[PDB]
Amino acid sequence: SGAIYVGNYRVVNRHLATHNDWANLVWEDSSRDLLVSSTTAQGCDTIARCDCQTGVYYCSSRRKHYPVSFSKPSLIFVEASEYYPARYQSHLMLAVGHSEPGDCGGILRCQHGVVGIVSTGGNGLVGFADVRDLLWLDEE
Numbered sequence: 001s002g003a004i005y006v007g008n009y010r011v012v013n014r015h016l017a018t019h020n021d022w023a024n025l026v027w028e029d030s031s032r033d034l035l036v037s038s039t040t041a042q043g044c045d046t047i048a049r050c051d052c053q054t055g056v057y058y059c060s061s062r063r064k065h066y067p068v069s070f071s072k073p074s075l076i077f078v079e080a081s082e083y084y085p086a087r088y089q090s091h092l093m094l095a096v097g098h099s100e101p102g103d104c105g106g107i108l109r110c111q112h113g114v115v116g117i118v119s120t121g122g123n124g125l126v127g128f129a130d131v132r133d134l135l136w137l138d139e140e
């Protein structure tokens, strides 16, 4: 579990969005596993606008932040689960790091800000949904 709070927006994994997030929907993309909802309170996270490939992510299954090297956002094949059939998820970045079911929503950060959130994983890999191309998160 976990979310990004920037401006008047709440960014979450689409598969973990609540019925309230859908009522307050701003934008969603099933192919990216992302959902953005509106908030009454202003958030304090800053989104990174860079091409960094190294950062630090939060791993809830270990209660630890780990430094990682990660790939550029790409179309990556993800196995079927209770949330989606087998498909390609877009804007996904992979790293060698621990993750287990329950870890989605952990923040990946670099020196410039929030890069993304955990969205996939398995076999000593962890996948992050990139948010650095969503330039509109900085305005209105």
Ligand SMILES: NC(=O)[C@H]1CCCN(C(=O)Cc2cnccc2C(F)(F)F)C1
Binding pocket: 015, 033, 078, 081, 083, 084, 089, 099, 100, 101, 102, 103, 104, 118, 119, 120, 121, 122, 123
């Ligand atoms: N983006 C998706 O399709 C997710 C939806 C939930 C399921 N999913 C996973 O990969 C779940 C997973 C499995 N093994 C290790 C780590 C994980 C976790 F980090 F929690 F994602 C795909």
Ligand SMILES: [Zn+2]
Binding pocket: 048, 049, 050, 051, 052, 110, 111, 112, 113
């Ligand atoms: Zn950066």
